[PDB]
Amino acid sequence: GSSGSSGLREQVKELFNEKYGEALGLNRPVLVPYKLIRDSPDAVEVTGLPDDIPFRNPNTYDIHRLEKILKAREHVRMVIINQSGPSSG
């Protein structure tokens, strides 16, 4: 319930998605199966995120977190714990 232009949200979206891709060893951004990771916390590892900020759907965070995350976009790093992905899609 605010006025302006919700961009960060999307920015963060592509961010987490971007990380996933790189983590998957791909060269393209891929959505993050938070639903899975949720039930399976030993599926993908998420790090680099800002302190005092967990790792969940970017569609909930606040201007701060949204920014913090973005402020740690270069720090944010994903590591495939248990999943393994194919090559050349």
From Swiss-Prot:
<feature type="repeat" description="GTF2I-like 5">
    <location>
        <begin position="8"/>
        <end position="83"/>
    </location>
</feature>
<comment type="similarity">
    <text>Belongs to the TFII-I family.</text>
</comment>
<comment type="subunit">
    <text>Interacts with the retinoblastoma protein (RB1) via its C-terminus.</text>
</comment>
<protein>
    <recommendedName>
        <fullName>General transcription factor II-I repeat domain-containing protein 1</fullName>
    </recommendedName>
</protein>
<feature type="cross-link" description="Glycyl lysine isopeptide (Lys-Gly) (interchain with G-Cter in SUMO2)">
    <location>
        <position position="35"/>
    </location>
</feature>
<comment type="function">
    <text>May be a transcription regulator involved in cell-cycle progression and skeletal muscle differentiation. May repress GTF2I transcriptional functions, by preventing its nuclear residency, or by inhibiting its transcriptional activation. May contribute to slow-twitch fiber type specificity during myogenesis and in regenerating muscles. Binds troponin I slow-muscle fiber enhancer (USE B1). Binds specifically and with high affinity to the EFG sequences derived from the early enhancer of HOXC8.</text>
</comment>
